[PDB]
Description:
The structure holds 4 chains of a larger assembly.
Chain A: E1 2-9, H1 11-24, H2 28-42
Helix pairs in contact in A: 1-2
Chain A binds two DNA strands through strand 1 and helix 2.
Amino acid sequence: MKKRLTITLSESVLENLEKMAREMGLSKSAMISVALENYKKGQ
Amino acid sequence: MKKRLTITLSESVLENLEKMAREMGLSKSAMISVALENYKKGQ
Amino acid sequence: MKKRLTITLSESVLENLEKMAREMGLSKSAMISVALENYKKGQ
Amino acid sequence: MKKRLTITLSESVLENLEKMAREMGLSKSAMISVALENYKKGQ
DNA sequence: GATTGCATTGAGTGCACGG
DNA sequence: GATTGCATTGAGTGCACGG
């Protein structure tokens, strides 16, 4: 059910990822997953 | 300075990552980066 | 930064947790974390 | 039939789990269960 | 830039060859 | 019902003693 993948991100977008996941106590993989879902929704 | 990140995503979330990316004419890294900056906005 | 804890939940709330985390490709620990955060916010 | 679940939470998210729980006069399991049913609502 | 195999440590990540 | 130590496998969970 889980697949790996390597992405490239802006040194500033990644630094932001950090903070966000941190306050939400999430992993980047989870924060990303949350954000992806989120976005999908708002679409 | 751009940096790389190896993450793990749920097949279903990945599948939809692809879908959304195609339709937005962006790469996964790009899509993810959008959604990420988006969530930060939505608050 | 991470701490363990054992909770007790309704057979129906847990069954729901399942679905939700599943579609969001999240762990319960993550889904719960998301939901907790969420709630905090709406407060 | 009620069931048990051992989860892992980020200290900061746990700390705020406690805060919110106290103030709502509920147990963590209870709080978590609320928030969980809540998110499902918010959609 | 991207995909992946090798590797490790509490799946999610790093690293680097091969593209 | 809750906390925790023991245990395992891709931290997040199960299991069960002790409460």
